[PDB]
Amino acid sequence: SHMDIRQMNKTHLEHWRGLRKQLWPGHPDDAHLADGEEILQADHLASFIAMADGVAIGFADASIRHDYVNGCDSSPVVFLEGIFVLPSFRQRGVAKQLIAAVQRWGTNKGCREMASDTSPENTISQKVHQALGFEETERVIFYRKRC
Amino acid sequence: DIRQMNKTHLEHWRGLRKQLWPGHPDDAHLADGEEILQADHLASFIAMADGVAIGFADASIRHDYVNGCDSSPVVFLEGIFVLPSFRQRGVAKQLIAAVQRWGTNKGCREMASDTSPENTISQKVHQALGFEETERVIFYRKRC
Ligand SMILES: CC(C)(COP(=O)(O)OP(=O)(O)OC[C@H]1O[C@@H](n2cnc3c(N)ncnc32)[C@H](O)[C@@H]1OP(=O)(O)O)[C@@H](O)C(=O)NCCC(=O)/N=C\CSCCC(=O)NC[C@H]1O[C@H](O[C@H]2[C@H](O)[C@@H](O)[C@H](N)C[C@@H]2N)[C@H](N)[C@@H](O)[C@@H]1O
Ligand SMILES: CC(C)(COP(=O)(O)OP(=O)(O)OC[C@H]1O[C@@H](n2cnc3c(N)ncnc32)[C@H](O)[C@@H]1OP(=O)(O)O)[C@@H](O)C(=O)NCCC(=O)/N=C\CSCCC(=O)NC[C@H]1O[C@H](O[C@H]2[C@H](O)[C@@H](O)[C@H](N)C[C@@H]2N)[C@H](N)[C@@H](O)[C@@H]1O
Ligand code: NI
Asked: Which reactions appear under catalytic activity for this entry (chain A)?
């Protein structure tokens, strides 16, 4: 059936929250709500919903980042902040089309580079990133200290 | 003494920074210095001994997602290098303390950093200075 990638607006908020809670289970209930509203008002945040037959089968969150991005040489950068496709709809090209939409958005915003990161443990994600034309740039360990 | 970088430090800062990052074109350090001095959300700090720079830290105020962190903005240690001769004397500790104060003055509740999995010494350093490991990731890039 015909699939559409829709940039998320007020009308897709429930579709998006329903999927996001499956990518990140236990990511607090009030966070998803505030995140939704922020994204709709942003010019440096956009999310994209894969729709077919009137149901939402996957999503991607994207940003335009001005912070230094690991492995990139230019600024700003279009960044893949999250991506998830429902188990039953996987390996059908949903993520490919989601990422194409993120790229289109970032390109129209004047980004020269698209970036993403994933866990060294998530081998499917690594294969996916590489199939869709991403190259590995560097691996890093992050640290934090409370101020 | 640790001072915030200004126009007069640029040349000696560039000399140390090329040692941290030999890959960087020499074009870039020039540009990067101008950018830091122009930007409110960037600052660098220089450790001096007898008026010669022997260490530096580059820092930013980060407004985008930062791996391992839960608030925004974040003070981020973008780069730190101390001359081998001046190592293990607390120079890095003092540079990072200056970075942390700048970030607190910019309302950051978290300081973050990253390093190579092979850079074992830098890992001990973050550990020693009170940082905690958050996550390890692989970064990807696609040219648009
Ligand atoms: C990976 C998916 C999305 C692929 O979907 P698909 O539709 O099945 O793919 P396709 O389009 O059909 O396939 C594309 C290509 O890949 C190939 N492929 C697909 N599947 C496989 C396969 N199983 N094996 C081999 N090859 C495969 C396929 O052949 C295709 O080849 P080609 O282009 O046609 O030539 C899918 O399998 C899936 O949903 N899997 C489960 C979830 C998952 O792993 N998702 C994405 C992979 S990244 C992991 C989750 C994620 O997005 N995390 C984001 C970040 O989360 C966290 O950070 C967040 C933070 O938590 C938030 O609060 C902030 N707001 C933002 C911040 N970024 C962490 N701190 C970061 O470190 C994380 O990076
Ligand atoms: C690590 C140093 C700086 C420590 O200096 P010191 O003065 O000697 O330390 P100290 O103050 O004496 O010691 C403090 C504690 O550490 C302990 N310590 C010190 N030395 C050792 C030791 N050798 N063994 C064990 N313990 C040690 C010491 O005991 C102390 O503990 P305590 O207080 O006594 O309990 C020193 O050894 C040194 O200069 N080493 C060589 C350089 C080095 O490794 N530097 C930094 C390590 S990672 C920190 C951040 C950093 O610089 N990152 C570079 C990033 O660079 C790149 O990214 C850049 C990009 O390239 C740029 O273009 C962008 N503009 C910004 C962007 N961030 C990569 N893409 C990123 O992935 C990289 O992460
Ligand atoms: Ni259509």
From this structure: kanamycin B + acetyl-CoA = N(6')-acetylkanamycin B + CoA + H(+)
C-alpha B63 to ligand 2 mean position (Å): 23
Residue B115 contacts residue B72 (beta carbons within 8 Å): no
Tell me the C-alpha distance between A8 and A15, whole Å. 9
Experimental technique of record: X-ray
CATH number, domain of B77, equals 3.40.630.30
- CA A9/CA A37 separation, integer angstroms: 10
User: Which ligand approaches the C-alpha of residue A1 most closely?
Assistant: 3
- What's the resolution in A? 2.0
b (16+ CB within 10 A) / e for B24-50: eeeebbeebbeebeeeeebbbbbbeee
Residues sharing a CB contact under 8 Å with residue B140, sequence separation 6 or more, in sequence order: A71, A115, A116, A117, A118, A129, A130, A134, A135, A136, A137
Alpha helices (runs of H) in B5-137, residue ranges in sequence order: 10-20, 26-38, 91-105, 120-128
The count of structural domains within chain A is 1
Taking the CA atoms of A21, A9, A41 and A77 in sequence, report the sign of the dihedral they define.
positive
Tokens of A141: 């360990």
* Cβ pair B116:A137 closer than 8 A: no
CA distance B120 to B11: 29
Domain ranges, residue A117: 1-147
For residue A97, the one-letter residue type is Q
